[PDB]
Write an enzyme that holds these catalytic residues in place. Structure first.
Site, PDB file in Angstrom:
ATOM      1  N   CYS A  28       0.798  -1.227   0.000  1.00 27.70           N
ATOM      2  CA  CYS A  28       0.000   0.000   0.000  1.00 27.70           C
ATOM      3  C   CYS A  28       0.838   1.289   0.000  1.00 27.70           C
ATOM      4  CB  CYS A  28      -1.007   0.001   1.161  1.00 27.70           C
ATOM      5  SG  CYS A  28      -0.283   0.085   2.824  1.00 27.70           S
ATOM      6  N   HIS A  89      -2.695   1.294   6.738  1.00 28.17           N
ATOM      7  CA  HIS A  89      -3.047   1.241   5.328  1.00 28.17           C
ATOM      8  C   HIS A  89      -3.217   2.667   4.826  1.00 28.17           C
ATOM      9  CE1 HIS A  89      -4.488  -0.680   1.676  1.00 28.17           C
ATOM     10  NE2 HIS A  89      -5.554   0.098   1.688  1.00 28.17           N
TER      11      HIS A  89
END
EC number: 3.4.19.11
Length: 152
Positions: A28, A89
């Site tokens: 990510c 994230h």
């Protein structure tokens, strides 16, 4: 659009490896780093938690996912992020209809696999767990990254 440059950067970054040997689709933070690099936006280094820490210290925070989508529609790079106990994230917010009238569409990679991956087809409210999606931070850069529409 005016987020076409951002969408383009997302598409281009999908198959790149910001960290050598690690496809961005599986990372990510690497995915967001590549997008920012293409757009010329300075970013804090590191993993998702580190990036969120840096953005928290330097970037304007938006009030809602709706505002995030609006800013992206104006040509700004907008990052959705949340720190984790072990892993955070991050995702790029793009313009588009809000999921459940609340959660903006996004691009993101993830080592978790499909559940954490979006090629513009999922919202942050699908990628993040229900216990996380209302706790997200939305950060916007101080200048628009996209340009004027084509003159001709």
């Amino acid at each position: 659009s005016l987020d076409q440059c951002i969408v383009n950067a997302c598409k281009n970054s999908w198959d790149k490896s910001y960290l050598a040997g690690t496809p961005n689709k599986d990372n990510c933070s690497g995915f967001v780093q590549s997008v920012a690099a293409e757009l010329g936006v300075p970013m804090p280094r590191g993993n998702a938690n580190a990036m969120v820490d840096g953005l928290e210290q330097s970037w304007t925070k938006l009030a809602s996912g709706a505002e995030a989508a609006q800013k992206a529609a104006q040509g700004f790079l907008v990052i959705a992020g949340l720190k984790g106990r072990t892993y955070g994230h991050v995702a790029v917010v793009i313009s588009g209809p809000l999921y459940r009238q609340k959660y903006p569409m996004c691009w993101c990679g993830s080592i978790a696999g499909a559940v954490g991956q979006s090629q513009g087809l999922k919202s942050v409210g699908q990628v993040w767990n229900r216990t996380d999606r209302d706790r997200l931070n939305y950060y916007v850069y101080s200048l628009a990254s996209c340009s004027l529409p084509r003159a001709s």
